[PDB]
Amino acid sequence: TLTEELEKLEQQITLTLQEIDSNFAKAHRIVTTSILPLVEQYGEHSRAVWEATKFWKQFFEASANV
């Protein structure tokens, strides 16, 4: 009973450790999956928006510069 529970909980600990590793790696996969290309696309479209603002900003600069 004593050594029984010892080995049992020891195996539970090892299993739980492997489970933690699995969840951890799952989060790792999620980030490495497509989050980086997603934000790259976001920044790309944002860059396009800056090209949009590149025109009208000139007029505001002109207003400041008379």
């Binding site: 007029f59 505001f60 207003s63 400041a64």
Partner: protein, 65 residues
């Protein structure tokens, strides 16, 4: 002298006629549009301010804030 008479008479007749034309034309030409001009221009101020003066306003607001 009839030739002198004809000269001064016809010439001054032309001058009087031209001066009548001057008075009428100058008065209408410079009176009629004037009111229309200033009316449309005060309204133009009321309109142009809503594109340009507000531009200065927004610029000042953002740059200061």
């Amino acid at each position: 002298l009839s030739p002198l008479e004809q000269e001064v008479l016809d010439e001054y007749e032309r001058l009087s006629e031209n001066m009548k034309k001057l008075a009428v034309l100058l008065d209408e030409l410079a009176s009629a549009p004037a009111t229309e001009i200033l009316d449309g221009l005060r309204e133009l101020e009321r309109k142009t301010s809503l594109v340009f003066t507000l531009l200065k306003a927004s610029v000042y607001s953002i740059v200061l804030q």
